[PDB]
């Protein structure tokens, strides 16, 4: 079953996403060891986060056309 991430893990991932929307193989290794998440989890988190960004911009675009 799905494990919910800690307040600390989420915060740290969110901080790296702002700096970089895409991760390198090296940066993914660093964060996996620091946050105690597999490289797979870090990979999927960034993928889902990119999808979240596309969604949020679309919502704002919808509202900007409604005016």
């Amino acid at each position: 079953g799905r494990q919910t991430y800690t307040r600390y893990q989420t915060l740290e991932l969110e901080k790296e996403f702002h700096t970089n929307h895409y991760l390198t193989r090296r940066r993914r290794i660093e964060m996996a060891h620091a946050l105690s998440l597999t490289e797979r989890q870090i990979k999927i988190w960034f993928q889902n986060r990119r999808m979240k960004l596309k969604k949020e911009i679309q919502a704002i675009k919808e509202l900007n056309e409604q005016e």
Binding site: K55, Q58, A59, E62
Partner: protein, 69 residues
């Protein structure tokens, strides 16, 4: 919470497409305009509906009777 008419439209569509309750992007776009809601709101509704409807069979059967169109 959505309007009684938006929920009505959504359930009528779901119960009449039970063999394939996966509306295409065009069907989601048409449902949203009809309900006065967003595509992502239609997307979330179908997702939640597909997993939840089958948790109480007796209730699903009563809605099929009621939402029959």
């Amino acid at each position: 919470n959505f309007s009684k008419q938006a929920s009505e439209i959504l359930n009528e569509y779901f119960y009449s497409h039970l063999s394939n309750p996966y509306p295409s992007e065009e069907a989601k776009e048409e449902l949203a305009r009809k309900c006065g809601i967003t595509v992502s709101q239609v997307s979330n509704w179908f997702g939640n509906k597909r997993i939840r409807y089958k948790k109480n069979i007796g209730k699903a059967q009563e809605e099929a009777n009621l939402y029959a169109a």
